[PDB]
Amino acid sequence: LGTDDDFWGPSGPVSTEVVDRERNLYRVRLPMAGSYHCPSTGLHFVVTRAVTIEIGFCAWSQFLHETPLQHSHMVAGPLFDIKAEHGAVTAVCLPHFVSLQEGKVDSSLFHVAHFQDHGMVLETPARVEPHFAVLENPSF
Amino acid sequence: MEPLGTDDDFWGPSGPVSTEVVDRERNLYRVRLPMAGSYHCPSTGLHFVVTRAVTIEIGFCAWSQFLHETPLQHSHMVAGPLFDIKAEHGAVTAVCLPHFVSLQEGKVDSSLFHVAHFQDHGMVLETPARVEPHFAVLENPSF
Amino acid sequence: SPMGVLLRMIPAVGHFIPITSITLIYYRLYLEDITFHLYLVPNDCTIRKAIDEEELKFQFVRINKPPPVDALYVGSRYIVSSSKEVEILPKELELCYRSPRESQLFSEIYVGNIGSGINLQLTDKKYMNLIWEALLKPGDLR
Amino acid sequence: SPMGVLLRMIPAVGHFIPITSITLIYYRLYLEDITFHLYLVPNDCTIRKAIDEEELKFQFVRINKPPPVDALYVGSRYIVSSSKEVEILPKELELCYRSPRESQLFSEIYVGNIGSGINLQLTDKKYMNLIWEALLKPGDLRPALP
């Protein structure tokens, strides 16, 4: 419910709706197939049909600890709880704040973490861009 | 079998007094000091001076949910652990609260230490009666 | 379920890598005097959101100004300064990642009356070069 | 009620003051080879307690060694080093206060064979003087419950 949190889409802007202000739970009704970009969060979605996506803000501290497995991985972007119907989402672009303009960061060292019920899954991105990583056919 | 006292016990005039664990998940402990005297716990850094036998309850706390309630809290930095201590009104003559600031340099002004005490109406900053190398002294505390 | 981007560390490099940072400026006008809170944080919408909410509780509201244009290194340190005579506490900020659930480091800048406007600066502590500034003027308050 | 010691900061100095730090060493042996976790934190029983609780979830065991002798400054940085054959991730530790609820940073040291022992060192990154040292030897590796 604000011009700052709009998604840019093929038929113009689509407004994010607040579902729970105190828990940072939001919702967007993408009106048709195509590519949508939210500059406020850095999220992009490529969808195949109209679909409702809801998006919660999370903290890694609940999920990522200093364990023998997780210790060698650094937080590189925000953590989102995303829910959308299967088969509707071609790709999600998850933002990251690592600078790649200098040839200092190997792109094969990026992963998408996915914290399911039985523990952390580590997903090699389809590709890594300057400010986001792409996950194809996500099962949220 | 076991040693007679450990780092987690309070060491007083009658030797070591054992700390009971009340809940080890929430880090709550209690100790019964048997008689008047000065007692100290190496593991925590706490000292108590009491005038009679008294039970003291001690919980480990985090500063987080207390230290973001007024803007004037921003100019004060954590200097030691936060303890939730409860004891019968009269018995505790003085409590020594550990701090981890180094005074050996002389680069820290003794007068800048305060004991923060979070009552239901907000924070009180009390001038310690003394600041020693590794603890601050609060006389006649009202827990 | 929850998801986001992780970067594998290299022994040579550790946590102190080059990142896109954002400056966040908040003000409160009280009586005739203005106080600024200046943050320097990774470009992370969940961090910016938690700071917005914490600052709003104390009636501080964000003023938009562009962020530093160069990538900055995690752990690098910056000196906060101003054109006008002002009280700054602390004078030094460190760029680091802190979870949106923890408090964030900021510099408090008590200005007094704003007058014509005030120029806030961030300077690399190491070699003293200007990395960022903003001109804050009465119109920017709105 | 809850009570603890606060220090009023001065504008010139800020948070970056001298404190009594402690090194905390944890280990896990898996055959010949061993992992050490080295922490450098303020002397605070609640931080030490939080670290000890997290390490024991993964069967890491604390090794008691004397702490650094000199007061160290918050925000200052320290290089972890050892002999040629030990992998260290990360090499730099920064001394700072993080709440006992926050994850605490450590350096992970992996050595394929302990041999006679590993000499672990902390060096001030600004002027390269050694400030802390430990010799971790097989005799120091004691069973899990102390």
Residue numbers in the entry:
A (entry chain A): 48 to 187
B (entry chain C): 45 to 187
C (entry chain B): 188 to 329
D (entry chain D): 188 to 333
Task: Quote the passages of the study that discuss this structure, keeping the authors' original sentences.
Nucleotide-binding domain, leucine-rich repeat receptors (NLRs) mediate innate immunity by forming inflammasomes. Activation of the NLR protein NLRP1 requires autocleavage within its function-to-find domain (FIIND). In resting cells, the dipeptidyl peptidases DPP8 and DPP9 interact with the FIIND of NLRP1 and suppress spontaneous NLRP1 activation; however, the mechanisms through which this occurs remain unknown. Here we present structural and biochemical evidence that full-length rat NLRP1 (rNLRP1) and rat DPP9 (rDPP9) form a 2:1 complex that contains an autoinhibited rNLRP1 molecule and an active UPA–CARD fragment of rNLRP1.
A crystal structure of the rNLRP1 FIIND of rNLRP1 shows that the purified protein is autocleaved at the predicted position between F968 and S969. This is further confirmed by SDS–PAGE analysis of the crystals. The structure of rNLRP1 FIIND resembles that of the autoinhibited netrin receptor UNC5b. Inter-domain interaction between ZU5 and UPA largely involves the first β-strand (β13) of UPA, which forms two anti-β sheets with ZU5; this explains how the ZU5 domain can block the release of the active UPA–CARD fragment. The catalytically essential FS motif20 is conserved in NLRP1 homologues and in CARD8. H942 of rNLRP1, which is highly conserved in NLRP1 proteins and in CARD8, is located adjacent to S969 from the FS motif. Collectively, these data suggest that H942 of rNLRP1 is a catalytic residue.
